[PDB]
Design an enzyme around this catalytic site. Sequence first.
Site, PDB file in Angstrom:
ATOM      1  N   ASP F  17      17.689 -25.612  36.100  1.00 48.79           N
ATOM      2  CA  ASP F  17      16.806 -25.259  37.300  1.00 48.79           C
ATOM      3  C   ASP F  17      15.689 -24.177  36.840  1.00 48.79           C
ATOM      4  OD1 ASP F  17      15.393 -23.920  39.431  1.00 48.79           O
ATOM      5  OD2 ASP F  17      17.385 -23.625  40.562  1.00 48.79           O
ATOM      6  N   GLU F 109      22.551 -12.944  39.320  1.00 51.71           N
ATOM      7  CA  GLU F 109      22.079 -14.093  40.072  1.00 51.71           C
ATOM      8  C   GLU F 109      23.265 -14.327  41.072  1.00 51.71           C
ATOM      9  OE1 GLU F 109      22.444 -18.044  38.416  1.00 51.71           O
ATOM     10  OE2 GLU F 109      20.637 -18.586  39.492  1.00 51.71           O
ATOM     11  N   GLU F 118      30.458 -17.853  47.641  1.00 53.12           N
ATOM     12  CA  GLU F 118      30.993 -17.239  46.285  1.00 53.12           C
ATOM     13  C   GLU F 118      31.456 -15.844  46.784  1.00 53.12           C
ATOM     14  OE1 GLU F 118      28.111 -17.898  43.058  1.00 53.12           O
ATOM     15  OE2 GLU F 118      27.147 -19.670  44.336  1.00 53.12           O
ATOM     16  N   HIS F 266      18.380 -25.318  42.672  1.00 56.73           N
ATOM     17  CA  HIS F 266      19.996 -25.866  42.744  1.00 56.73           C
ATOM     18  C   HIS F 266      20.857 -25.377  43.807  1.00 56.73           C
ATOM     19  CE1 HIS F 266      20.633 -22.028  40.942  1.00 56.73           C
ATOM     20  NE2 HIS F 266      21.992 -22.348  41.106  1.00 56.73           N
TER      21      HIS F 266
END
Lengths: 330, 330, 329, 330, 329, 328
Positions: F17, F109, F118, F266
């Site tokens: 990405d 990130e 997540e 992505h």
Amino acid sequence: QYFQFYGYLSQQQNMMQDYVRTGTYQRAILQNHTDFKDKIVLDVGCGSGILSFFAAQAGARKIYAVEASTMAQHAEVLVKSNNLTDRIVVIPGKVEEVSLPEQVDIIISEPMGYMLFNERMLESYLHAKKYLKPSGNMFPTIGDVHLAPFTDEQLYMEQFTKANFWYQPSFHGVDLSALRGAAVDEYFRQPVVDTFDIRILMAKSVKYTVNFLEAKEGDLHRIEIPFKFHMLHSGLVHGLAFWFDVAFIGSIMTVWLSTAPTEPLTHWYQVRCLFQSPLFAKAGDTLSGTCLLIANKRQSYDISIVAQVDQTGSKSSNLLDLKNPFFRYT
Amino acid sequence: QYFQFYGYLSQQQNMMQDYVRTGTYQRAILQNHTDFKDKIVLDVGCGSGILSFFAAQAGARKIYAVEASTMAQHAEVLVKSNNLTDRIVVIPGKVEEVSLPEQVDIIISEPMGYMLFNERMLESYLHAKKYLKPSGNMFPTIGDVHLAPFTDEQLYMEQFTKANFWYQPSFHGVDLSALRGAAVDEYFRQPVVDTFDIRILMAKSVKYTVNFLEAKEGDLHRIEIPFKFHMLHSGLVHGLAFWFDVAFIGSIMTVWLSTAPTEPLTHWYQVRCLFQSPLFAKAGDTLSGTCLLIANKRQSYDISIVAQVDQTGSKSSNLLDLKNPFFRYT
Amino acid sequence: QYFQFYGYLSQQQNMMQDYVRTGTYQRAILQNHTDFKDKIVLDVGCGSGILSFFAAQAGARKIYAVEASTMAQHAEVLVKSNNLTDRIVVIPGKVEEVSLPEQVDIIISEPMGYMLFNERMLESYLHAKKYLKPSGNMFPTIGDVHLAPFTDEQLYMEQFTKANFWYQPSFHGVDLSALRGAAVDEYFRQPVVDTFDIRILMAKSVKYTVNFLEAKEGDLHRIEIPFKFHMLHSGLVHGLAFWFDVAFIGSIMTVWLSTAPTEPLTHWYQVRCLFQSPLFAKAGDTLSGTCLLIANKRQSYDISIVAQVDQTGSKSSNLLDLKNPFFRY
Amino acid sequence: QYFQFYGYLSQQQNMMQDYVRTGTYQRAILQNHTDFKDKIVLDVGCGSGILSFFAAQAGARKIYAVEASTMAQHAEVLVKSNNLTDRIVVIPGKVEEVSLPEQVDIIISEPMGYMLFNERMLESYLHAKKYLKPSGNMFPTIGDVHLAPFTDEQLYMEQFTKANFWYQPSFHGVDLSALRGAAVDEYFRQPVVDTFDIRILMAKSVKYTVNFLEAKEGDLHRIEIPFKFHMLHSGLVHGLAFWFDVAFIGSIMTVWLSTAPTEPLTHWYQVRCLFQSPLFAKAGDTLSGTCLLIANKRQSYDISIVAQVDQTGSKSSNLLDLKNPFFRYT
Amino acid sequence: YFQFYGYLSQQQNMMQDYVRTGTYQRAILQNHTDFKDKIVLDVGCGSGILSFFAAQAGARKIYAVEASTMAQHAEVLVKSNNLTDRIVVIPGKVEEVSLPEQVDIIISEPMGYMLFNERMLESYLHAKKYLKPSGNMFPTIGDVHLAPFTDEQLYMEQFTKANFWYQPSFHGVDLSALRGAAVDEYFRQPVVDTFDIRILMAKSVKYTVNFLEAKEGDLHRIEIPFKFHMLHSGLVHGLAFWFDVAFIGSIMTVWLSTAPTEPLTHWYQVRCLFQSPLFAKAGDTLSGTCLLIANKRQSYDISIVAQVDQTGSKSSNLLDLKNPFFRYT
Amino acid sequence: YFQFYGYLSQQQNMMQDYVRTGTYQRAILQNHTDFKDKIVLDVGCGSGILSFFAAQAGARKIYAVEASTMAQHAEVLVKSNNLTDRIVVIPGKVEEVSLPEQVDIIISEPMGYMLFNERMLESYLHAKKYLKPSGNMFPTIGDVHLAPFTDEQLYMEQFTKANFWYQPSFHGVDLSALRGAAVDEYFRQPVVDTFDIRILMAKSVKYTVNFLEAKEGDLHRIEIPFKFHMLHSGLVHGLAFWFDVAFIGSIMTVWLSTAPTEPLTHWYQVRCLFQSPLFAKAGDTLSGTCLLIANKRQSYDISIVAQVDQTGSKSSNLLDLKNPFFRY
Ligand SMILES: Nc1ncnc2c1ncn2[C@@H]1O[C@H](C[C@H](CC[C@H](N)C(=O)NCCc2ccc(O)cc2)CNCc2ccccc2)[C@@H](O)[C@H]1O
């Protein structure tokens, strides 16, 4: 066939989406409220009724809304659903063949076609003055056609690229070459409808004016537009470009609707008639000639453009078919 | 000047990416291991040396790898990094000019070009037999060029589409028309390198064979290929299609490398020579004539194709420059 | 007025670029050379004359090429420039009105329209049989219209989405809403010309054959097509899809030109007619009803489709105007 | 045999389809008509003769059109067919070797190549001033090379992706690894011809001007371009980008043809010279050095670029072969 | 693993192996006397399909065991098919649940990639604690086959992918130090796809497991010696694996094969690559051992050591069956 | 959970990405005075890319925490780039290890699909226990955007894909009783892919998380109200989601957007369907709430409810962000 096209709501939808046109008409009418307040109005070719509704919004007492297509039925539906059946009377038929029970104070219409004159709807607009009271008004009141010489190598060479399809000696065994000239002539006879950068214009525009209050239906059978351009740029002149302006001359305000390339785009775009033989001009030369429109039996005109560069004597003569316009815009 | 472009590793990478070719050479050599085991080999035009590595894998005692371009320096680097400097000797220069310390049992090479004969490298290959022992072998051993008439309306018409760029009377004021015929001629003089579906072929192929073991250089200066096609389909013959097969005739097996359109695609593709005047043929007709290749000073051939339909007497005569192919594949 | 369109070389150029159509016709003619060799031919609606040139390639003695539009003038120029005045005579006019000097062995034409029958040119083709010798042939010889049920949620919903303009309650002070139903009705009445993935078809097609050697002009005035689909996929049935096949049944071979979505695309694309209201069906169900075409004065047909799921009995109909197709491609 | 490939009409057609170039040359000539009117003109490397035709449109008395390739034969055909035999004389041969019977008032040509200097045609253009009167002009009159540092991660990494083809230990049994570094060096030696978004430039361009009226043929054998960039963005500098402008400085108007990335694309695109070792700079740093061009026998230049970040002393030195550009635009 | 098996979209995908499902059906139906009025255990039944086949063969009682929540959907299917008298779904792991009754035959699909992946064969064997004396097992035996192969394209692909890391300035970062580790990682992944039999360089060697005789513990360490007689010369890039199982009924033996000469199943075939390939001449012998050791992640650690006996060249390889590469497209 | 991050192939895929990587490098290099001689913490460093960027900006010392076996590869890269002094790799979850120094800035990130998937944002926030009171975070803030969409094909697929389950005799078995459950299953999958902005029926509404101010516990339960002013009439099939983050430096603010108007990343975009589509006219208002409740499997249970205010018409869905459907 002309009027069948106009019977489709898909088509009406498309027509109503010109916001420059619609806003300008609404403004001409609403800002000149004293020209409509308690007046009798004729709307020539109303479609779904939009200009008649504007006249009702400006206070008209009665509006006769004439429409020759089956769109008249849909206008009637909208008049009722907007609670205006006492004020807008839909009249199915051609304005040339209907009866009005009454003479009118003002005629409203959108009779302009490509190059102003396409459709020959201006003749219907002028015919309708038989219903106009003495000293009645017309919206639009006057129309100006503008023409200017252009250079556009790309547009010019496009005609040959397309015609050269025919310049091949064995299309499945058949030599097509003999039709290449006929294909060229056909493409050059089509006026080109799209917009362009004003930088292509080689001289200031010349105009030709029709005052709709004075003009007679017959005058539009044969329209002779003279021109003398003083060339501001040197180059190859590939044709003349056309646009138009109309003015609504009210008692309060004069409002203009322009389809010039210097203005926001309308559904009329602009029109270009190509010269199969281009003319070379230098800055300061004069490009003179005449554009002649003769009315034909197809709601259109045959166009004859002859132009010459006075200083060299090079001439170009061009015949076009305003009933086969080429829509090039994207 | 000719061998300059072969000096670049980018170009070598491209040539190594023909996996049909590489894999077929490797099989031909390894499967014929008794033709290499403890033998002396000459590799004509080794590039980065790949075929020499294959000879080594099959157990050759010694391989002289001759390379005319600066690619020879890169081959020498590979040989050393692959721990083979004792078995592969890289000799910089043309096989016609260098010296070998001894005679060899077998010569290996990739001398085939477009239409088999382009590059005139087959002559270099045959020249190299002055080093070959009596009853030595060559890999490839024979080559068959095939020709067949085809029809392809798209390809034919494309030539005129491209030449018709010149068929315009005012390209920025300039009449280009007079060059149209010369532009057409130029396009038809280029053999077209690409692939095609086998359904475009109109008769069974004719072949012409060179036995590399028996042939001499002089036999490749003037190559005359008569043809008599029994037309299986009716239609317009737009030209002849060419491809080739080589056979590696070893003591154990015969392995073919085919560039036919029925086989997986290689970097030679196939080649089509067009007729500016196509020939109409009916099924059962005979299309006869001569393809003649005359060797020239630019590593290539002047091509002449003369064909006629015997039953009708219509004729097509065509000259092509194999030095200047059109690479059409995408 | 109808034929004016055909008088333009631009239109002819566009038509000539259907290479599937042209190649198939050339093959049909050339492979059946014994049906042309030294024969007299009628080419109905020849345009620039391409089919006539094919008949000449196959050895015809004489071909009468009839063309109603001013394209006849261009056909004539091509016949002269190709040195074929011996063998091709161009006759300006409709095939129904002209006179020929003699009877013919075979008639060739491209009379098929959208959904086969549009243009009503099939009638002109059948009418031309007054010039046909006994035991003469026609190319095409037969035509099969095919219909199959489809599911396409995107197409169905577009009909409403395209009418959204009409919801506006204040388009410059005007409420447009009362016309929204009519806009939607109008859109549903347009047959849809475009192509599609075969994965949208929910059943093997049903067919209707017109044998051009047997059929009479009048048979095409009222065309009635019944169907009973056996559904191979479960889902919503939004309408019927149509295409056609023609066969050139020569003495040597039979050559097919197909416009099916499984075959390469032609200038006829395929056609889809929606139901007012979609019908649910499960795999193994059957869908039955009829498609009725009635010839009108505008070179086209009024199409009536009535269909139902036999198990549940959900019913839908529609009446469409083949004179106002929507070209969605 | 440098001129062979220019003798092909297919090549000439491709060249003629740069409409920005053709239009700008025509405008420069037509708007500066007084520099051509009744004057004598030399056209250097005329190809099919297009510039000679523009000079004839501007009223030149006589035009000597010099062309070294077989394209000269095709120009002569166009001169005859455009009825200009009395005004345009085509002279086949190199401008360095032909005879002219007459001195000229103006030289016109398109001598520019990639990075301005590629082809070394500028030397021929300067050489032709032996025919130019002291009062005379040259179209174009000046040329400016522009260079600027860029960052382009994708471009930089592509060189290694390509070279890594060789980084494999068993390509049909052969370890290709030892060639990886040579492949890398080869790719970095190729200037990259394509276009790019101006957002990749990390400082304002520096320029280097050649005045064609002043310069001598010999000044182009060794060209030293010093540079000092005031960095406007922090990042990695992957090399230098190059483009060029030319000005036609007429007695009436100055017209520019720019190949900058802010301008419409031309057939020259833009060129990027990569650094194998990138340089890190902060905004406000100064990146200085020299670009040195040394003429070679392949009608091109050996390029040397030496660059340092002045504040840190981080250096990069790079050699490129302008004779082997990589054409990346797709 | 059991979370993944709980989904109906996964079940659907699993049920669409027609070679597998049909073959299991023929095995069960054509040995109807092995089922007629018998007690059945179905190990890992999924939505229950194999239990349904046993019912179709007239079994009296079928205990269907399933560890995932798919067991709830199997219960629904049984009730809807009116089979609650004869099929009893038991939610849970066959190791831990309770059965009221011993059984005549066990049925299951315990085969993974390379036969042994998932270690579900140890659950199949464990289930035999419920098996009557003289009981049967479907499948009854399993053969794994291995054979050396050559495939330049597959081999070189590993380096093309790993060479991503072979660059000195990825946004300023030299990535090169990881290229070796990436290469090793790719070579550790068994490759799941199919291939043309012409890549095989020797006749296969097999290793057989008799599920009637075998104990759960026999599969913790699986050692497979091999000696290949090389039929072709070339580079050996690794070993290809596939398996066959037979259902040994009293009426017939039915084979399910995943061989590359046979119709494709959802097991495909598997290839274990050698990072250092071995050159073999026709007539050479390639010998060594493939050793599989059970790990905590429902899988095996694989070791393959091979050498060309005539030259001494050796290749030693470690693979992780828990991270296969699915290459089939 | 972290096992799949241990593979270099998966790391290669993420590094591709280029929009993401370039934007982070620009954020850091343009705000060099935020890193110069400073101490930096990199949460979830992977192979270490962002830590190298902080080094490029002149950071004194960078602590790079990585929970998977990718930590071993990062340490290899750190050493091969001769940065072992300046970048210290710490294997482990940032919540399960102590750090030896306070930091001036945290880089990470942590964004997942729909921003929150997540639950890595909680980890990012957890790390603030090492951030000095005057310190910064890169990214500094994150805006999740939602807008209603129309897409009849996506809606119908949920039913079509279940057609397998209709069959009344699959090898003599009737599957029909499961078709309903199959449909419900597909509906609960958020759909990850991209789309044309023309499907959007109103201007987006946003929900901002300020990473400098938020507490870890704030992300356990996230309520997002919305009121859309509809710009087009037609059926609303669901809500589309994307997100923007800003790196608010002392010199420049740099944005990274995953919007459908920007180059694809992505993260693509995410769509959640209603069980039944809602009809709305242009000028109507569509109001409701999206409620995200954190679950044990590093994800959220998503509840979306919407209504057309002028008509009272309602739809909703309950989705499982742990089982997204990758449609792209
Ligand atoms: N000394 C010379 N004397 C005579 N005759 C010469 C000489 N040097 C060059 N000649 C001729 O001159 C011509 C090239 C002319 C200039 C070509 C120009 N420098 C260019 O486009 N360069 C980029 C493309 C390229 C070229 C080579 C290459 O390696 C890579 C890229 C054409 N001008 C006139 C013109 C203008 C508009 C449209 C078409 C043409 C050729 O015909 C040469 O034979």
